[PDB]
């Protein structure tokens, strides 16, 4: 027995998942393509119409599921959609997807690109969560991607103000970011306490270490994303510019570009004053003492100067000190972080004053 509602045809035995409203997703086919067949009830026929329309407008993005067709019979409405590997919940909870060798930062960059696309088309998802974010089937080059599907919300992932602006999605994304990164934790705790904690603004990002550079940069972003004030949350395009998505090569380039921007620059100047403020503690009182034994033999403003000079004169430097420092650029920048885990976070926050400048266009959003 196999249901055929032309051009759609699904096998009733093959079930991919279930929906909270009674909807059931089957493994089926459309125009000789392997698709996912979403079966919806008559109570949700109205919902289905606006869902497939929003998709008609946005499915061209590679991070928004591809929508194929909708066929209606006397009993149900069927949505032929792109076939995927798992949900982001199934990916994070079951670490047998570990062997897929996917990068969490790449999945979150992919999720935020899809979100940015919806927001650019003047679409607010309103229900972003790991169940709704999908893992694609490996393409011909074996690459897997994160995609957005299923468009008032679902408990624990709803912005406090929602109890219909784009910033509601940034809140939800902020929780998804921590969920992926921590590997299953949520800023507002366990599943059943989340919405009460959101209303109360009671959050914890304690999986993120305060003296670990990767955890520091992730926290700078996530805290602004899950902000109780919507107006304080960055746009999707601002999130995509954050150092959380930068490569080790890019991070080092920023440290060079900022040290190039200072000198000549007077201390009373509006740029040098904002950079020096509160670090001190960023440099760990004295940066000369915490450095490795051979480098010390060879102010943030002068620490950045040291890093720029040793980078520039790297191949005309002794083999003993380039051994403890390099190889450049990856291992060289990883030397200084987490030697100073607040170095990049502080410099990025401080150098915001130059966002508009052409040299700082790949680092900020205007
Ligand atoms: Na797509």
Numbering used by the authors: 562 to 712, 732 to 743, 751 to 885, 896 to 963
What do the paper's sentences say?
IRE1 resides in the ER membrane. It has an N-terminal stress sensing domain in the ER lumen and a cytoplasmic kinase/ribonuclease domain which are connected by a single-pass transmembrane helix. The lumenal domains dimerise in response to ER stress bringing the cytoplasmic domains together. IRE1 then undergoes autophosphorylation, generating a specific endoribonuclease activity that hydrolyses 2 stem-loops in the pre-mRNA for a bZIP transcription factor.
Purified, dephosphorylated hIRE1 crystallized in the absence of nucleotide and diffraction data were collected to 2.6 Å. Our crystal structure shows apo-hIRE1 is a symmetrical dimer in a back-to-back conformation similar to the structure of phosphorylated yIRE1, and distinct from the face-to-face dimer previously observed in ADP-bound hIRE. While the unphosphorylated activation loop is not observed in our structure, the kinase active site has features associated with a functional kinase: the conserved Lys-Glu salt bridge between Lys599 in β3 and Glu612 in αC is formed; the side chains of Tyr628, Leu616, Phe712 and His686 form a continuous hydrophobic R-spine, although the side chain of Phe712 is mis-aligned; and the gatekeeper Ile642 packs against the αC-helix. However, in the apo-hIRE1 structure there is a large void between the RNase domains and only 227 Å2 is buried. However, in the apo-IRE1 structure there is a rotation of approximately 13° between protomers pivoting about a fulcrum at the interface in the N-lobe. The rotation keeps the N-lobes in close contact but leads to a ~ 10 Å displacement of residues within the RNase domain core. The contacts between monomers at the apo-hIRE1 dimer interface are symmetrical and mainly within the N-lobe. An extensive network of salt bridges and hydrogen bonds is formed between an acidic region at the C-terminal end of αC and β4 on one protomer and a basic protrusion formed by the β(−1)-β0 and β2-β3 loops on the opposing monomer. The activation loop is well defined from 711-726 and 732 onwards in the ligand-bound structure, whereas residues 713-731 are unresolved in the apo structure. The twist in apo-hIRE1 disengages the RNase domains, which might reflect lower RNase activity.
